[PDB]
Amino acid sequence: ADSQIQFTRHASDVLLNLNRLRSRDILTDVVIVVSREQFRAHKTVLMACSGLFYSIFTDQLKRNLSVINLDPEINPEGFNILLDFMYTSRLNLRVGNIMAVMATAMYLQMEHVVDTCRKFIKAS
Numbered sequence: 296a297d298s299q300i301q302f303t304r305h306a307s308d309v310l311l312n313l314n315r316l317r318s319r320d321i322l323t324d325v326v327i328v329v330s331r332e333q334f335r336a337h338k339t340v341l342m343a344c345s346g347l348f349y350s351i352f353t354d355q356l357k358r359n360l361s362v363i364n365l366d367p368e369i370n371p372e373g374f375n376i377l378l379d380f381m382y383t384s385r386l387n388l389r390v391g392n393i394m395a396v397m398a399t400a401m402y403l404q405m406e407h408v409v410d411t412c413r414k415f416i417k418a419s
């Protein structure tokens with residue numbers, strides 16, 4: 296409710312602890328395979344951040360999968376940048392990664408990140 300006491304730092308603190316759990320492989324429940332690379336994560340965080348992962352895990356036919364093989368055309372560094380963003384709220388857009396990050400974000404259906412990439416290319 297809008298009447299309750301607001302903890303303005305709570306959401307970021309929760310996400311920080313979720314990233315800490317990922318760094319220790321605690322309760323991770325899926326491995327994301329991107330070409331020769333593998334990334335372990337929590338399905339709930341992937342679903343919350345990505346329309347692709349939401350559509351995958353919300354379907355009862357795929358919810359229980361422990362391995363997800365992404366399109367092998369996806370660049371592993373671009374995916375790692377977006378996975379870090381999911382868990383940190385910080386997006387590492389550089390001149391050398393912007394195109395890979397953007398195309399990956401389109402594939403992952405993260406529109407907010409896609410729109411932000413469109414401003415990075417514009418502001419360059």
Ligand SMILES: CN1CCN(Cc2cn(CC(=O)N3CCOCC3)c3cc(NC(=S)NCCc4c[nH]c5ccccc45)ccc23)CC1
Pocket residue numbers: 342343344345346347349350404405406407
């Ligand atoms: C106009 N739409 C165009 C297509 N977009 C796909 C999409 C993009 N994201 C990432 C995203 O928007 N954000 C913004 C906030 O910061 C994190 C990343 C998504 C995340 C989820 N995950 C969950 S749990 N959604 C629960 C509600 C829900 C969404 N669709 C539903 C369908 C059926 C039932 C419920 C829902 C699902 C879909 C997307 C959505 C908007």
